[PDB]
């Protein structure tokens, strides 16, 4: 009966990580994954692509679901959604709905997700077994509000958590990242690395 989403990392039976692509931070990046940060930093409204991994092959009809939740203890309570200016700006592509700060591209079989008893957003592709040449799912999510959004996320840091779930929505394991949607991910990301050492 909690409403607020676990954040536990757990691989689960079926070996379940993600993989992020390699960039570095140049300040034109659209998206730069920090592996010291965990921590993705990207534009908005850019594809992220999110690379995820199966090491034993799931059940039929299993999903990958990404949802984002407050980072902080004192937030996690509030749903995270688009500002109310964001919404209104008619900038849907058909599917995803206007309030919806995760989206995904490039995915046939995309749903979203309303929960009614939590009012939390989710996004949700189904799993299926990668190519003869393919390794992993690759997954292109975006962002469609800054970190900054007033009315929205209001400067607060966020966590995408992906589970891996049965169709019915049962839980096979969870993976998790911080994000921040700004104007510059790479100059941003360079920054909270280098606080990092000195
Ligand atoms: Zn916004």
């Not at 676990?6 to 039976?13: A, D, E, P, R």
């Not at 991994?53 to 799931?58: A, L, R, Y």
Request: contains cysteine; charged residues 20%.
């Amino acid at each position: 009966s909690s409403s607020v989403p676990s954040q536990k990392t757990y691989q689960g039976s079926y070996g379940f990580r993600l993989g992020f692509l390699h960039s570095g931070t140049a300040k034109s990046v659209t998206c730069t994954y920090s592996p010291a940060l965990n921590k993705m930093f990207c534009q908005l409204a850019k594809t992220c692509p999110v690379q995820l991994w199966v090491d034993s092959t799931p059940p039929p009809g299993t999903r990958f679901r990404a949802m984002a939740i407050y980072k902080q203890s004192q937030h996690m309570t509030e749903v995270v959604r688009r500002c109310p200016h964001h919404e209104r700006c008619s900038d849907s592509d058909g599917l995803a709905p206007p309030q919806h700060l995760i989206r995904v591209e490039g995915n046939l079989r995309v749903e979203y997700l309303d929960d009614r008893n939590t009012f939390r957003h989710s996004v949700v592709v189904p799993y299926e077994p990668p190519e003869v040449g393919s390794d992993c799912t690759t997954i292109h999510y975006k962002y469609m509000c800054y970190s900054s959004c007033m009315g929205g996320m209001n400067r607060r840091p966020i966590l995408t958590i992906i589970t891996l779930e049965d169709s019915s929505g049962n839980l096979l394991g969870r993976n998790s990242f911080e994000v921040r949607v700004c104007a510059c991910p790479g100059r941003d990301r360079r920054t909270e690395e280098e606080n990092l050492r000195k």
